[PDB]
Ligand SMILES: [Cl-]
């Protein structure tokens with residue numbers, strides 16, 4: 809599914825993302841916007857390294873989920889990458905929380921550094937009741 813902005817914001821808040829390991833909801837919104845356009849079914853193959861990015865946060869198969877087809881990969885979220893292509897984003901959120909338990913935190917996603925870091929991101933949550 810493709811979430812509407814405010815629907816997603818409330819969805820993430822219910823799932824405990826607001827301020828998780830220091831990360832405001834608006835930072836998670838900005839991440840989702842630029843990774844996927846709020847689209848849970850998005851996949852992107854990285855021909856360079858044979859990995860794939862899955863779902864609303866575009867979580868990578870090399871480290872985070874298992875797709876069977878990525879050489880040398882591990883699965884720190886202990887999920888099938890399929891779980892990151894559900895309309896229900898609970899598993900994706902659990903996996904995003906796992907990512908940011910690692911030292912880089914949200915810096916793990918380059919798109920965040922590019923499109924969100926050091927920016928005014930207040931617009932993402934404006935009006936949403938969150
Ligand atoms: Cl911030």
Ligand SMILES: [Cl-]
Nearest residue numbers: 886887888891
């Ligand atoms: Cl699974």
Ligand SMILES: [Cl-]
Nearest residue numbers: 893894895896
């Ligand atoms: Cl679903």
